[model samples]
Target: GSEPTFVVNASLLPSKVLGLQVQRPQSFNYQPGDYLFIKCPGISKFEWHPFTISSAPEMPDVLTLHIRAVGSWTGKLYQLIREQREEWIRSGSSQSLPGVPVYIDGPYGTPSTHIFESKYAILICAGIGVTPFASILKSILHRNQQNPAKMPLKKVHFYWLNREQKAFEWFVELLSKIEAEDTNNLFDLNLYLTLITGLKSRTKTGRPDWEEIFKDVAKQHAPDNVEVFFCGPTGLALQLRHLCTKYGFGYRKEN
Candidate 1:
């Protein structure tokens, strides 16, 4: 009995933040909001960090994560990768942090509950939290394609709040594809991308507008039945949950 060892092919990057490619391991199969335990040599510690599997599972063996260099552990992970640049140049290899033992404990999390079955699904996400909602959308779209006679998705509404415009760059391609294929007015998903930078930004200014977030809810579905998924900073989640409770909707928390 031994710990399983797998080689993660680093080139198949799903999302890159400040230069670290949230890589897809050759055989990794998972949905968004799932986490894995990775060990980097210099770090000398096992940290169970949660990363949203940004890439959809339909493209099997493809996985990705969005990471922000916010604290000690994350900051170290980013720098370690950068420090290895010269070694990569010499070996013609994708840069690698010296291997420390990494253990795969889980793909744990709720399989993104598809609110797509209803007339509309509202997704509220902030910062890297948008990861799971993106996966939910991909899963729903994949299902509709696999069963065309079943009718395309009814609607998908995404509310993304971000501090910087650059953070959303990775999703542009996927969003563009969704727009081009939207022939049936039935699939009426709209994105409320808000930037909480200041009062004069091109998109909605400051934080997400509560009214805008709930604007289509009443018109879209029966209050009790419309499914909503929100993932993000604690404050936003709290505010959204309060609103959900106020207007009668279900909320699930992911730790």
Candidate 2:
């Protein structure tokens, strides 16, 4: 257990499912793959939940989280970040906003996936599971800044899955910004949106076709050597784990 500090900073981006900004407590230092134990005050029962830091360390004091209001902790968080009012369009307790209290446990995690070292890397993330890779990608970009011509990541592919288009909407701007800065970078971070019910024809319809996605990747390069990482629901994670193991890319335990 460590001391948790409370600080106030304007929410840079706030939505029903995510919030991004630079908070106070300037002493905190976190790297990509690090997890923070965030506290939302009053809702203390959630314990020290682990959330992967999405922003790179270069941008000090700034933190971003893609949260789903599924449980008590995050649900309360959603209410707190927004101004509440009882008589609005959706209508009911819509004019009150709760204060946001965040705690950073510094950063901790050593991901040896070596995306930057590999010839190519494929990342498949579903819903909130996409948080970790955001940090990893930014880290890679940071590393590239130090050595301009030492670009080891030839290609980095991504497939993001979620039921509603709105759930996966927030990061589009960030992705656009990244691509805009780097003109010739071949890190093809393609985003694949999957709709669960298939109502709108605008996105890829039906449940995620993992086979189709993998086969498409294989057509371009050897799937055997590509290091792939997945984060999402339990079932999907397990399925991907099995597939990766079958393809000789399973998690390697370090002593």
Candidate 3:
């Protein structure tokens, strides 16, 4: 078991996502899709929750997590941080906020490690499940920025589905920044808000047409050369697996 470590930096509700930045242990290294088991004694003495790492390995000094307030434990943890953030704002403090005590355990197992091997990378994410790919996307973008000729990937498509517009608020700025800076146009981003009926000019309403999506993917890359990765609900996972099997595309799922 890894020992508890204090958060070196914390941003509460930054774009409505709780961002925690902690010191990375010298001995610890994690890949893009890996997760961490976190235990916050302030919230629960015994319960530990798992969160996907949202920061890429290219940034080695700190480990980052983008957490949503979903359940009892998470809600409480968010409240704690929110209060501290409010206090800091009121005081106009420049010093770093006080550390939050937490225990972090992993860069645990993932279903596949071949994300970089494929010619095309198709990522499907729902709500908070988008966390893991944040790291993966950043890694790819960083690699391309440093040396575009060395990157193996030809194209990357990211599909994000959310129930409400608020869910999209957290990562919208980051995604927009990434899109604006991508001179090569190697990334395609699609956002779907299920609750809306009439579509916004830039976003779609309801779910994606998976059949059409795969059909287009098939046209560009050989079935064996495309990699599809999903992290979301079980029902969606099954649906995606069926699509992958039907199309002969290599598929991997992260819970």
**Tens-digit lDDT string for candidate 1 (93-126):** 5555543233344466663444644455567777
lDDT of 2 by residue, 122-146 (tens): 7777777777887877777777668
Q: What local distance difference test score does each model get?
A: 0.56, 0.61, 0.79
Q: What is the C-alpha local distance difference test score of candidate 3? A: 0.79
Ranking by TM-score: 3, 2, 1
Candidate 1 all-Cα RMSD? 5.1
Clashing pairs in model 1, backbone N/Cα/C closer than 3 A: none
Off-target runs (Cα >4 Å) in candidate 3 are: 14-16, 91-96, 195-201, 253-255
Candidate that scores best on TM-score = 3
Each candidate's TM vs. the true structure?
0.74, 0.74, 0.88
Which has the better lDDT: candidate 1, or candidate 3? 3
| TM-score-superior candidate, 1 or 3 | 3
**Candidate 2 vs 3: which has more TM-score:** 3
Q: Please give the range of 10 consecutive residues that has the lowest summed lDDT in model 3.
A: 194-203
